[PDB]
Write an enzyme that holds these catalytic residues in place. Structure first.
Site, PDB file in Angstrom:
ATOM      1  N   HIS A  22      53.217  33.837  94.335  1.00 35.24           N
ATOM      2  CA  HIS A  22      53.001  32.857  95.372  1.00 35.24           C
ATOM      3  C   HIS A  22      54.289  32.489  96.115  1.00 35.24           C
ATOM      4  CE1 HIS A  22      49.130  32.884  93.630  1.00 35.24           C
ATOM      5  NE2 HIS A  22      49.162  31.759  92.943  1.00 35.24           N
ATOM      6  N   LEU A  26      48.482  38.953  86.518  1.00 36.31           N
ATOM      7  CA  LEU A  26      48.859  40.336  86.295  1.00 36.31           C
ATOM      8  C   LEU A  26      47.721  41.098  85.655  1.00 36.31           C
ATOM      9  CD1 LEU A  26      49.753  41.162  83.147  1.00 36.31           C
ATOM     10  CD2 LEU A  26      51.378  39.329  83.564  1.00 36.31           C
TER      11      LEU A  26
END
Length: 327
Positions: free
Chosen positions: A300, A286
């Site tokens: 993911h 992030l």
């Protein structure tokens, strides 16, 4: 009771990027992401055979158009026929270039036109360099770096998912790659806490499978001591803390890969103060957009990038500061 939870609206930014990671903004506000097929191969079945194979290839650094989500390949790093495996990025202050932790190559400095220099085959004591994953500039310009991989290429790729050979480095402003600690099981995200006046004073390092955040006191460039457990990462799932970043009040936001949550730690750590439920299981990294409340998140589950709005602006990154403060 339970840790408080919120559940924001995430808006899609881009997709189809295996192992999407290394979100970063350069000095012109261009947005980049890295693709890591090695990360993807590591989180899948038959990961031993698969990831070994995938490590002979090269990952990618991409520029993302924020409006359309279109991807442009900036750089596919390789040295002497060994493919790079970049993960995390930071932008430099005095020039518009990315410092990039690479699990096969160590540390790279990558220009917007796609050229790159590999920074170090060896550390300051002459030990072979380890492959790197995440890095963080302090306001003095030292780059703090986690190294979960074994020796860099030409050595075969190895990673400290089970055994404790992950290391920490500090690449100092005068060009020294100094190993500052070792013996981590898969160190991941790293961050620097600063005093209000700019002095770096605390290093936070994620140790992924053990569900811990460690802290050190920063005494100066490459000088850390008083290693302690600082924060606890919820859950018993495969995964744990990955990428992390500070907001402007020094709350640390941590991607807890496999938990469906980003954890929020207050300045003193311990248990998270809140959790942020994501619409995917695997938040990976992030990064705040400069002068906004907007957090960009890579994940993911769908191999995509998203964004959401947080309570306040991110901590000013090194690249947003001015060498002389006022200019």
């Amino acid at each position: 009771m339970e840790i408080p939870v919120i559940e924001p609206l995430f808006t899609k930014v881009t997709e189809d990027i295996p192992g999407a990671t290394g979100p970063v903004f350069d000095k012109n506000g261009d947005f980049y992401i890295v693709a890591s097929p090695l990360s993807e191969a590591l989180t899948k079945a038959n990961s031993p055979a698969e990831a070994y194979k995938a490590s002979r290839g090269a990952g990618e650094i991409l520029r993302i158009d924020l409006k359309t989500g279109k991807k442009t390949v900036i750089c596919k790093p390789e040295v002497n026929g060994y493919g790079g495996s970049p993960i995390g990025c930071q932008c430099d202050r005095d020039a518009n270039q990315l410092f990039v932790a690479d699990m096969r190559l160590g540390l790279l400095v990558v220009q917007t036109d796609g050229t790159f220099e590999e920074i170090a085959k060896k550390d300051s004591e002459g030990r072979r360099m380890q492959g790197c994953a995440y890095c963080a500039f302090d306001y003095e310009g030292n780059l703090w770096i986690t190294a979960p991989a074994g020796e860099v290429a030409p050595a075969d790729f190895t990673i400290s998912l089970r055994e404790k050979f992950g290391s920490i480095y500090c690449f100092t402003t005068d060009g020294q790659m100094i190993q500052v600690d070792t013996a981590f099981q898969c160190p991941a995200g790293i961050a620097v806490r600063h005093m209000n006046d700019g002095r770096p004073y605390q290093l936070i390092v994620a140790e992924q499978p053990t569900k811990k955040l460690w802290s050190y006191d920063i005494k100066g460039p490459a000088k850390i001591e008083n290693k302690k457990v600082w924060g606890h990462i919820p859950g018993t799932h495969k995964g744990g803390a990955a990428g992390m970043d500070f907001d402007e009040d020094n709350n640390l936001l941590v991607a807890n890969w496999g938990s469906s949550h980003i954890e929020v730690f207050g300045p003193d750590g311990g248990q998270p103060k809140m959790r942020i439920r994501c619409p995917f299981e695997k938040p990976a990294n992030l990064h705040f957009k400069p002068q906004t409340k907007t957090i960009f998140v890579t994940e993911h589950e769908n191999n995509a990038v998203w964004k959401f709005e947080w309570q306040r602006n991110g901590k000013k990154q090194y690249c947003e500061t001015l060498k002389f403060g006022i200019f």
